[PDB]
A paper describes a structure:
[name] ([name]-[name]-2) infection requires fusion of viral and host membranes, mediated by the viral spike glycoprotein (S). Following host receptor binding and proteolytic activation, trimeric S mediates virus entry by formation of the so-called [name] six-helix bundle that pulls together the host and virus membranes. In the case of [name]-[name]-2, peptides derived from the heptad repeat 2 ([name]) region of virus spike (S) protein show promising inhibition of viral entry. [name]-based peptide inhibitors presumably promote bundle formation together with the heptad repeat 1 (HR1) region of S, precluding some or all of the intrinsic [name] regions from binding to the HR1 regions and thus locking S into an extended, prehairpin fusion intermediate that precludes viral entry.
During structural characterization of [name] bundles by high-resolution cryo-electron microscopy (cryo-EM), we observed the formation of a well-folded N-terminal region (residues 1159–1179) of [name] in an extended conformation, outside the original range used for previous peptide studies. Based on this observation, we further extended the N-terminal region, beginning at residue 1157, and determined the cryo-EM structure of this extended [name] complex. Nearly all additional residues at the N-terminal region of [name] are well ordered and form an extended conformation. The additional N-terminal residues of the [name] fragment interact with the three HR1 α-helices. Moreover, the densities for residues 1164–1167 are also improved compared with the previous reconstruction. Residues V1164 and L1166 form hydrophobic interactions with the groove of the HR1 bundle. In addition, the backbone carbonyl oxygen and amide nitrogen atoms of residue G1167 form hydrogen bonds with the sidechain atoms of residue N969 of HR1. The N-terminal extension of [name] interacts with HR1 in the postfusion [name] bundle in an extended conformation. In contrast, the Omicron variant has three mutations in the HR1 region—Q954H, N969K, and L981F—and all located at the interface between HR1 and the N-terminal extension of [name], possibly explaining the somewhat weaker inhibition activity.
Residue numbers in the entry:
A (entry chain D), C (entry chain E), E (entry chain F): 1159 to 1200
B (entry chain B), D (entry chain C), F (entry chain A): 918 to 988
The structure:
């Protein structure tokens, strides 16, 4: 008599990426601050 | 002279707003890519887990049947 | 003697939606390109 | 004449910026909806998996107890 | 003879946060509507 | 007089666009934080599930070996 080995499906390869948009947020805030230098003072 | 000042300030503001719009588009694209990748990851996880739980279910019913035969 | 059947909870219904904002990204890039046609040339 | 040109260019730019802001708002709304749906999906998955692992734990302890009684 | 108790790792602590940016979307739409009050009418 | 009107409308529009850019930056920051938190949650879930499935595999092979010894 014998018994087989139960091999379960591997899920370690499933990975979730991370987003890095801090450059774009910093640029948006920088432009929002720099638009004060574009105000018209007649 | 005031017209040239108005035009220069307007052109500067339009350039900065173009930069801001390009940054917003790039950020939205990166967010879309990452959200879709995590969605595919979760779906793959659910599929693989369904397979694994089916396998565990089959093995457990087999073990229960063996125990029933023994006892 | 008998043994019951172990029914495990089904999780196949769990689904993750996908986002489709390519129209909005394309519109943003199109406006960023078209704002050159709004520059003042006195 | 230059004033009319400035006004026309400014109105065109403001219209385009309004379009861009509407597009950004729509994109952010869609991203919020999808991120929240995937969050609810992950939470439902964790809850269902907790239930399933509790069931597997109970069944496995029962099988171990049966084996202990047999041997 | 004895048999140990199989304690499986707890995963109940894993939680996914939710985002609330409805204030920002509402502000963006409000500004897109209010920019009509900034149009130049010579 | 028309120059003052142009300047006032331009300054108002630039202020509103600054508000819109700040709102977009805040929204993108919140979306980034939540997407990254859900990504870490999914990764932690995959790691813990790998551990749990390894444990279940070991226990099931042990139970199968015990049954083989019995029968």
């Amino acid at each position: 008599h014998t018994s087989p080995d139960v091999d379960l499906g591997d899920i370690s390869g499933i990975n979730a990426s991370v987003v890095n948009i801090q450059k774009e947020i910093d640029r948006l805030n920088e432009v929002a601050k720099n638009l004060n230098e574009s105000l018209i003072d007649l | 002279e005031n017209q040239k000042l108005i035009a220069n300030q307007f052109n500067s503001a339009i350039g900065k707003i173009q930069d801001s719009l390009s940054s917003t588009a790039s950020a939205l694209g990166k967010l879309q890519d990452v959200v879709n990748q995590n969605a595919q990851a979760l779906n793959t996880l659910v599929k693989q887990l369904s397979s694994n739980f089916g396998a565990i279910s089959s093995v457990l019913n087999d073990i229960l049947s063996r125990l029933d035969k023994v006892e």
